[PDB]
Amino acid sequence: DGRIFKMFIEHLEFEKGLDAFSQSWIKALEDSEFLAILRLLFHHIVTSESAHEFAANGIDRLYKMVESQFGSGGDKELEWLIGRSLIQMSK
Amino acid sequence: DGRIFKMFIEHLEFEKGLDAFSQSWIKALEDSEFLAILRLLFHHIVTSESAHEFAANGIDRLYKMVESQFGSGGDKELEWLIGRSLIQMSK
Amino acid sequence: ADGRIFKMFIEHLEFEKGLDAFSQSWIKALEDSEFLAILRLLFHHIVTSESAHEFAANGIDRLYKMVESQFGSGGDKELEWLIGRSLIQMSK
Amino acid sequence: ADGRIFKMFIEHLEFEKGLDAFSQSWIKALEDSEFLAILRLLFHHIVTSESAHEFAANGIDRLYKMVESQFGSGGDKELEWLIGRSLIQMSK
Amino acid sequence: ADGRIFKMFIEHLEFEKGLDAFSQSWIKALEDSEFLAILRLLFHHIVTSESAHEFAANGIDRLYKMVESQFGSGGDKELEWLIGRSLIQMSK
Amino acid sequence: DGRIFKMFIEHLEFEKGLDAFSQSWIKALEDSEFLAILRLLFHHIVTSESAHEFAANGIDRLYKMVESQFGSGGDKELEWLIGRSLIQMSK
Secondary structure: OOHHHHHHHOOOOOOOHHHHHHHHHHHHOOOHHHHHHHHHHHHOOOOOHHHHHHHHHHHHHHHHHHHHHHOHHHHHHHHHHHHHHHHHHOO | OOHHHHHHHOOOOOOOHHHHHHHHHHHHOOOHHHHHHHHHHHHOOOOOHHHHHHHHHHHHHHHHHHHHHHOHHHHHHHHHHHHHHHHHHOO | OOOHHHHHHHOOOOOOOOHHHHHHHHHHHOOOHHHHHHHHHHHHHHHHOOOHHHHOOOHHHHHHHHHHHHHHHHHHHHHHHHHHHHHHHHHO | OOOHHHHHHHOOOOOOOOHHHHHHHHHHHOOOHHHHHHHHHHHHHHHHOOOHHHHOOOHHHHHHHHHHHHHHHHHHHHHHHHHHHHHHHHHO | OOOHHHHHHHOOOOOOOOHHHHHHHHHHHOOOHHHHHHHHHHHHHHHHOOOHHHHOOOHHHHHHHHHHHHHHHHHHHHHHHHHHHHHHHHHO | OOHHHHHHHOOOOOOOHHHHHHHHHHHHOOOHHHHHHHHHHHHOOOOOHHHHHHHHHHHHHHHHHHHHHHOHHHHHHHHHHHHHHHHHHOO
16 A cells, blocks of 8 residues: 555545545545645556657657758747747746 | 756855855745746655555555445446546646 | 746847748757757646647537437436447457 | 647537537547546556645645644644654654 | 644654754654655655746746847747757757 | 657647747646646656756765764754755745
8 A cells, every 4th residue: 555545545544435425525636735636546557558659759759840841941930939939938 | 966966056055064055055045046946946855655555556556445335336336436636636 | 017938038049130030049949958958848838738628629529419419317317328339248 | 719628528529419419429428448548547647646726735844833833833843743753653 | 723744754753842852853853764765765756846936037037038028029939939049959 | 759749749830930820829828737748758858867856865965065064063053954844835
């Protein structure tokens, strides 16, 4: 078992049937430290095989494909668009 | 040394004794780009041996244990509870 | 009013003196390691965490409100179930 | 008013036509790759970053305010020390 | 009004009884595994996500507003370009 | 290709020349699920060789260097400062 798992499990009531269990979970979701644990729990499942490749060479395929359709013209354009995207993430 | 470490260190005053040092750190904490560095600094230390296992097979132990106590009945229940948890994280 | 990191970054750039002059300095600063590293840090900040206005606008919450509006909390309770089933299927 | 990603997702689902009909469509959509991937992305969004209301409610800040309320900034200065010692011990 | 996690954590600590008494309990609690793990979790929360006030204050947005103020949206459009070029150079 | 990449690409118009392309990107940036994808895209590029070392032994070099300049005196001081930093991240 995890340290984490033990502590997670201790939030929940298993001995008193479906409703007691429900109550405990529902109650726990009121504590933000519990939500944080639940995130650890889901972290891996919401990951993609694809995602790692896409972060590893995605702008490269994207850059080639832009060049393919628009020529050097397109490089300057994509750069502008990406910058515009970072600016967007910062505001 | 890191690129990062050099730049980190450059925020701080080492040559003028405890208080000058204190002042510089305290002053730096006013700049949010500095806090970001400090996060890098602490990222690994706040990690758990446990945590990786828990993200890797935690819902599985959890799912079995639910079934153990409540039967098929419990599966439908846990699913509902997890969904309710994601909904919670989104609001 | 700025902070040490940004100050060192700003320092590499011409802001008086006109627009080309600015790009000019930026292009040049770009082959300096120190400039490049700080930028990467600045970038990393806005890439690795998100604005609250952005977050509040996620699909899961849009979804939740369509379901509700249409089916009330009964639908919420069901959507909640479906979401759970899906997330489980995603691990299996 | 929605966005391309959510639109494609929504598209897989029956919202007219009643509640069962909805779960029905959801269950079916679930063996379609495209639906499953988008959901995983939607999920990933709300799993890998946090609401401001949620964050403001962390334990460290609760802790900080108990300490303060009870011992004033003198206690803050001490708690701050203890926290540091702990974090160091956690690396050692 | 607190939550199970924090309650168990709080439990290890003397808050009546005076300031030394508090550090005392903290120092002692520190060689207990359970205390140490929960703290690490608490820590991890505030290390792995950020306050909105903190985020709103990033350098990229400072930068953006200097550029604008000085060169208007024309400058924005240019800065945007430069930022793109840089980010590309960072992958190459 | 990625699952992700396909879906990313589907936001954008390539067949109708620079402006149509611009329009589509600009339009996409209005959807927060799209920004999330763009983050995946940039995640790796904004990473540092340095950063990993700095998270792996940075407080250690920092701790030594403090001791070097200030003696045992400095340990108690650095601890206080770090704590003060976590407190700061939590408010």
